[PDB]
Amino acid sequence: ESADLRALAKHLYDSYIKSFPLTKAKARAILTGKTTDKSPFVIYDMNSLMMGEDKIKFKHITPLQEQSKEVAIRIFQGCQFRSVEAVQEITEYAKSIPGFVNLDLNDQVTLLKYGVHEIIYTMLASLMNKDGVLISEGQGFMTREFLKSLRKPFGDFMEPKFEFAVKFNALELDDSDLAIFIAVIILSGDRPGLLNVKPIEDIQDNLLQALELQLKLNHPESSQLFAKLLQKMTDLRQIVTEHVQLLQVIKKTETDMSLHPLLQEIYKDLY
Numbered sequence: 001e002s003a004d005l006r007a008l009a010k011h012l013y014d015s016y017i018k019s020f021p022l023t024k025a026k027a028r029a030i031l032t033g034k035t036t037d038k039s040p041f042v043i044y045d046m047n048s049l050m051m052g053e054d055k056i057k058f059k060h061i062t063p064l065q066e067q068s069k070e071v072a073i074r075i076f077q078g079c080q081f082r083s084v085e086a087v088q089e090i091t092e093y094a095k096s097i098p099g100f101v102n103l104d105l106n107d108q109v110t111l112l113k114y115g116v117h118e119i120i121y122t123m124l125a126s127l128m129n130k131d132g133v134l135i136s137e138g139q140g141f142m143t144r145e146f147l148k149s150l151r152k153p154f155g156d157f158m159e160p161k162f163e164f165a166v167k168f169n170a171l172e173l174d175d176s177d178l179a180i181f182i183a184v185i186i187l188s189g190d191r192p193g194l195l196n197v198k199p200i201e202d203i204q205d206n207l208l209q210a211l212e213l214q215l216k217l218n219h220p221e222s223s224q225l226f227a228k229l230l231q232k233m234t235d236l237r238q239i240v241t242e243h244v245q246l247l248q249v250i251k252k253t254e255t256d257m258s259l260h261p262l263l264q265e266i267y268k269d270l271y
């Protein structure tokens with residue numbers, strides 16, 4: 001129902017603002033230079049990487065395994081730590097989606113287990129342009145070309161994300177749009193091993209109607225934006241199946257690699 005659909009939209013945009021500190025609005029301002037907090041330190045090579053890590057002079061530590069290895073491996077590790085933080089933010093957001101915490105608890109685990117990395121890549125695009133990605137809460141910017149440069153396997157984790165982002169970003173979605181799109185993703189009744197499918201679909205159906213209205217109102221001139229966004233769901237699933245495969249490569253080419261227990265849980269027997 002129309003006002004119900006707008007009340008759902010405004011609800012999700014509100015939890016979204018509450019769960020994710022670095023929104024797209026805030027990322028675009030930094031990327032584009034519109035703010036007056038702190039212009040980002042750019043990492044484009046080995047020497048600037050050293051300086052950027054070794055920055056830590058008025059901006060100090062997060063609980064990440066700081067450094068005991070080569071470059072390719074320690075960038076991977078910072079990816080891991082940050083992807084862990086993101087899971088917590090995304091779980092906090094998921095509890096706010098109406099109907100979510102009412103579902104069978106094994107289903108809640110399962111929607112999270114399969115939805116979290118799709119959401120991670122959707123929202124990473126918010127921090128990216130064609131030239132690179134904002135890192136450490138918008139304090140750093142690491143260039144696409146530096147990332148593409150990395151010794152084989154790791155060089156390949158990054159580029160697909162960039163290719164997806166420039167195209168997703170051409171949709172010009174804003175935070176209020178993303179808040180509904182991300183909930184549509186999580187409420188996906190096709191995740192392997194769901195026990196009660198129909199309650200999830202019913203909730204997703206209502207989010208779909210709300211997403212459609214939201215785009216038609218927010219983006220009047222954008223023909224078929226709703227379909228175009230749902231089409232990106234397929235680029236997202238491909239990103240994740242790709243990433244999982246690059247994970248299997250890392251187990252072969254690398255010595256002790258070692259994921260965080262939360263990440264190990266999510267990847268355990270994943271698709």
Ligand SMILES: CCCc1c(OCCCOc2ccc3c(ccn3CC(=O)O)c2)ccc2cc(C(=O)c3ccccc3)ccc12
Binds near residue numbers: 263
């Ligand atoms: C979600 C990851 C976001 C991200 C970057 O993303 C750009 C490409 C995104 O593609 C991904 C996303 C998640 C990933 C990987 C590789 C591993 N993961 C997480 C995993 O599934 O283990 C690749 C690039 C450099 C980063 C660098 C950091 C750092 O704090 C950092 C650590 C050491 C030196 C300099 C910076 C943190 C996040 C970064």
